[PDB]
């Protein structure tokens, strides 16, 4: 910008979306990356592989396409994240993918977070992913319990669009139920 000698960061560095130092460390494994990402309303898992002209996504799942299997609940919570990971995971098996490394991009490794939920889901789907159990939220939180009890302290329904009053982690089960099953069109 300033002159001939000025150094401009690689595009994705100035867009502030890619941590290259962390990236290179991920790539050093030789395994596909389980790219876990999240937005205010959604969550998304992708199994990315290295390619000659850019990365190559071999499979993926999005919280949005969760309803496509019987989900009427929100898509920015824990139950959401896990199930998406699993959905993405299952599809990964389809394409022949067997192992992955967790890439949480610019998200923080907070214990019990969603990117870890996405990871536990993808692992349950059958993907071999280097992990650590005592960094994953407790099973019930994944189900969505923490929110039910939050809804317990009612007075004004937690959810605006009536999906249900006292919410449901039991639905999480019906949805996971449907995914771990064979039939299901991936």
């Amino acid at each position: 910008a300033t002159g001939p000698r000025y150094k401009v960061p690689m595009r994705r560095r100035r867009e502030a979306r890619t941590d290259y130092h962390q990236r290179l460390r991920l790539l050093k494994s030789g395994k596909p990356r389980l790219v876990a990402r999240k937005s205010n309303k959604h969550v998304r898992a992708q199994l990315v592989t290295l390619g000659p002209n850019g990365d190559d996504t071999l499979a993926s799942a999005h919280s949005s396409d969760l309803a496509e299997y019987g989900w009427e609940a929100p898509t920015g919570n824990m139950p959401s994240a896990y199930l998406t990971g699993l959905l993405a995971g299952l599809r990964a098996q389809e394409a022949g993918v067997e192992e992955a490394v967790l890439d949480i991009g610019l998200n923080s490794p907070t214990p019990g977070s969603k990117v870890f939920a996405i990871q536990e889901g993808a692992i349950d789907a059958g993907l071999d992913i280097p992990h650590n159990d005592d960094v994953l939220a407790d099973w019930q939180r994944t189900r969505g319990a923490h929110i039910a009890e939050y809804d317990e302290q009612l007075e004004e329904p937690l959810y605006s669009g009536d999906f249900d009053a006292a919410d449901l982690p039991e639905h999480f089960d019906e949805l996971r139920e449907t995914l771990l099953d064979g039939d299901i069109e991936l």
Binding site: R5, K7, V8, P9, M10, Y20, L24, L27
Partner: protein
């Protein structure tokens, strides 16, 4: 030379071009080459490890297997055959 260390006279060849300054892209550090492949040798100023003796900059050897992640490249220094342990970051495919 006044001294005979490895980086003697390496001022230019080991200095980065202003705009190439800073951490280099991971792509070429992770690249994979096959045995028999021709590769040009050129140290990347920005990359500390995996380098070969500067004196060999500019060579175009032949991947003949690898050691760990580093590559074993065969070259002919003058009339002598030498094997060079070098990481992808400092290699480039030929042609």
């Amino acid at each position: 030379p006044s001294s005979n260390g490895p980086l003697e006279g390496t001022r230019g060849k080991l200095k980065n071009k202003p705009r190439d300054r800073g951490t280099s892209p991971p792509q070429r550090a992770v690249e994979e080459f096959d045995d028999g492949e021709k590769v040009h040798l050129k140290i990347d100023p920005s990359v500390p490890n995996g380098r070969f003796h500067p004196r060999f900059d500019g060579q175009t050897g032949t991947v003949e297997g690898k050691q760990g992640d580093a590559y074993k490249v065969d070259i002919v220094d003058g009339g002598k055959e030498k094997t060079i342990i070098v990481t992808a970051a400092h290699l480039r495919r030929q042609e």
